[PDB]
Amino acid sequence: KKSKTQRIASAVNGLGFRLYKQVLGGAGPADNIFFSPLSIASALGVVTAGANGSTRAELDTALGFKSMKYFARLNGALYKRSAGFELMGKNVVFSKKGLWLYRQFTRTVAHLFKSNVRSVDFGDSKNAVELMNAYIEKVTSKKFPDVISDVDTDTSLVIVNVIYFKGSWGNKFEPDLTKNVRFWVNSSYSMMVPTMHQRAKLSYTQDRKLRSTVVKLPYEGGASMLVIVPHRTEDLPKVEESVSQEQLEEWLSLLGPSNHYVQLSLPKFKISVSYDLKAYLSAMGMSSMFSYGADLSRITGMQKLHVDKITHKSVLHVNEEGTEAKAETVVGIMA
Amino acid sequence: PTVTVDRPFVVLIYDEKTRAVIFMGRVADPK
To answer: Within 10 Å of residue A3's Cβ, how many Cβ atoms?
Structure first.
């Protein structure tokens, strides 16, 4: 939609949805799916800033549309702290201690991603992991310890995004109204899930086209959780197939104020998911940066660098107060 | 007028002004 921040937000969403669709290729219908498009876009923006040639191109096409200048504006607009709301995002870039970096690279990462580059002796790797994690933790008031598990000697850089969200519901649930209820994974496999309960004024609608219920759960801040429940859990692939920016706008238009009171029943849970994204991003067109013929020559000429590895790890905690959510994207660069 | 999230569901946490999606997913198995 028209605004500058809105265009880049839909690019990032576009990236997210495209990624979602790849995740489905390897997810049994009992699996949890959870990831932050912003975290992943931030980490890849850093890689983009050092890319050249075919590698840069593939990466620009995936991240869409001074393209990256309005990405930092978006993050500035989103990351805020106020009563019952926190969204915080941090990029960190570690570099090999001997390794000369071009200044145009270090300054665009300081300006667009707010990271100064910290150098590290990855050769002494036990300590290298403790040092990196200790730095990350220092800068994120202990929300993110242990973001890094392992680091190769021949590692030349590691790029890190983390993102933390904690939102209070606009309508907080009463703990007194929380009893176990059969949650149906399936037609056959059920389980007892502490399920929360409230009568509040929530926007909802039946999606007739997708045979599923949509509901908007506001947080404090200007944020909310959209929850989409297929009626038959066999409708779930056609729901998950349609996800797109246009579908999102669809679901948001179909939502009215609809502010007569609603009877809501919602699970209380903490789930966490991990990914290795190499194959998914490869399918989405960014296969180049993992080759031994990758071009990351804007980073340094001293060595020929490629992306070794990209992990993404995320956690979702829903309870009576609200929602707590973390994500962490890590990129390892080698020769 | 009733919403029961008793089955697998898609979940999106997003900013209203920018429509920026911050987390995406599907919850099929709480813990």
So the answer is: 12
